[PDB]
Symmetry: C3
């Protein structure tokens, strides 16, 4: 089966659901008005996510894994950028 | 192995743990006084969860996947109801 | 592929990422200053996590699964201790 991860924030709420399907992770978004496909699109067979608010601004971290390699993807208001995470050392 | 997803809220806390085991997802609940099996029981091989508070009221979203189909299940105070989520379009 | 779970707290933030790799779960930690391997090291093929604050103190629950057995691991300020969780009854 496909594998998913979810996060949410605020009281609307906003929800983001990430799905790993055939080696690709995609993103589905709710901001109160309907579901839409988000900008996130990166390789992975497994996904997890966390997020936090700084005031009203959301910050999201998606951890995408293929084989033994886990890559962190960061949203901080300006598109998806690679994070400093590594699995060891 | 079985696959799990967890969420929690407040300072007690309350915890909910969802487990996909042989194509079925079940729910275990802590509200401070012991673990009990919850009402949630729906098909799935994979599960993720998120939740949020509106005042003191909890809202939970469980994303259950089998094959390429992901179904959203909603708790909003009145049992489990199907959500509008779809994976694409 | 390896399987991960993530949680975070506060506005720094602190992040914890748990990874199940070849039957072992390990922990990676960010507290604002770099990634380091945490103390958590327990068996599992699948992992999920949740956490909550009581004032400034973090409490973490990691759910580690092998076969049909799910064990809860608790951080409450004093190392990792076994929790009361069981999957049924
Ligand atoms: C890629 C990275 O490590 N990002 C860091 C960020 O580093 C920047 C450098 O990559 C370079 O671009 O120069 C700038 C300016 O000096 C930074 O040093 O440093 C941030 C501050 O310590 C890290 O924290 C987040 O920064 C976000 C903006 O990028 C945003 O402000 C957020 O609120 C901050 O927490 C940032 O690290 C990334 O985020 C943290 C939470 C971890 O996930 C880490 O692994 C990420 O790389
Ligand atoms: C099934 C669904 O889409 N639920 C919506 C809800 O729709 C209702 C209709 O299904 C029908 O029953 O008529 C009523 C009254 O007009 C609604 O339109 O609409 C809600 C408001 O926009 C959605 O938001 C949540 O509603 C909950 C009560 O059902 C509760 O109040 C919660 O706080 C609201 O966020 C609701 O959407 C569902 O929840 C959101 C967060 C997503 O998960 C979405 O996919 C769910 O379907
Ligand atoms: C192992 C366990 O069940 N821990 C409980 C804790 O039980 C203690 C006993 O194991 C023994 O050591 O004697 C002491 C003193 O009487 C306790 O009874 O009882 C706590 C209070 O109800 C539970 O709640 C958490 O306790 C943490 C400290 O251990 C911390 O204060 C936290 O804020 C409390 O929520 C504790 O249960 C564990 O945590 C909860 C949230 C669940 O995850 C549960 O399955 C865990 O076992
Ligand atoms: C902050 C926010 O919600 N921005 C929306 C845009 O991005 C979507 O949400 C962010 C958080 C991240 O999940 C993106 O990958 C995702 O596409 C969105 O593109 C825009 C148009 O629909 O709406 C913004 O509000
Ligand atoms: C709000 C709440 O905790 N309700 C409890 C009842 O439902 C349990 O919790 C909700 C949030 C959801 O997880 C359910 O599937 C779950 O069964 C519960 O049945 C009742 C009796 O034990 O206790 C309520 O407080
Ligand atoms: C509360 C805290 O951050 N403690 C740090 C120590 O433990 C690390 O974090 C806790 C929450 C848990 O994740 C541990 O398994 C993890 O090792 C850490 O060992 C110490 C030295 O780096 O720094 C503390 O602040």
């Amino acid at each position: 089966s496909v594998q998913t991860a979810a996060t949410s924030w605020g009281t609307v709420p906003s929800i983001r659901v990430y799905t790993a399907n055939n080696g690709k992770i995609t993103e589905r978004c709710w901001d109160g008005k309907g579901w839409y496909t988000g900008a996130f699109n990166e390789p992975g067979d497994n996904v997890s996510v966390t997020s936090w608010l700084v005031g009203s601004a959301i910050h999201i971290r998606v951890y995408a894994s293929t084989g033994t390699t886990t890559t962190e993807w960061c949203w901080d208001g300006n598109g998806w950028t690679k994070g400093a995470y590594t699995a060891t050392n």
